[PDB]
Amino acid sequence: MIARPTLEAHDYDREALWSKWDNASDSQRRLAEKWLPAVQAADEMLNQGISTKTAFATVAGHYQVSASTLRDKYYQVQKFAKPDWAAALVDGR
């Protein structure tokens, strides 16, 4: 679950960011949920020091997503705290 966290440690108030999620359509939250297990699984593989090609290839093999698309998003959510990653995926360009 994107449970609901300890809204305690943050120089920025997310109510605005999470209000956006609450008002987002079901399809948008659903899309973010689909991309959340792929980005999270990739982090575990990089932690084990697996080659990026093999790490992304394995993820692209198990998940039907573009390896190039997932890599761009993985670095983009790096600056965002993991708990807000679900909200960051809602905000697409």
Side-chain angles (χ1 to χ4, degrees):
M1 267 74 250
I2 307 165
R4 14 76 234 314
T6 286
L7 295 166
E8 196 183 12
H10 18 62
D11 285 309
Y12 61 110
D13 42 306
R14 311 99 250 145
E15 345 199 321
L17 185 74
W18 285 113
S19 244
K20 212 176 179 30
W21 163 283
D22 180 17
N23 293 310
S25 199
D26 308 270
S27 114
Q28 298 194 323
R29 290 181 286 170
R30 194 205 248 293
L31 180 64
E33 183 180 10
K34 181 170 194 190
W35 281 90
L36 191 76
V39 180
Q40 214 174 75
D43 180 10
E44 263 182 350
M45 297 218 161
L46 300 163
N47 180 319
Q48 184 158 10
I50 295 170
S51 203
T52 40
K53 291 180 191 318
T54 304
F56 290 117
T58 303
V59 170
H62 297 329
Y63 294 86
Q64 288 173 348
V65 299
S66 255
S68 268
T69 301
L70 175 66
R71 176 164 31 151
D72 258 13
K73 296 180 184 258
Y74 193 95
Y75 285 108
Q76 184 166 352
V77 298
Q78 178 157 66
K79 284 180 170 163
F80 290 90
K82 288 176 205 172
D84 6 295
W85 279 12
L89 300 166
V90 170
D91 189 349
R93 314 304 294 142

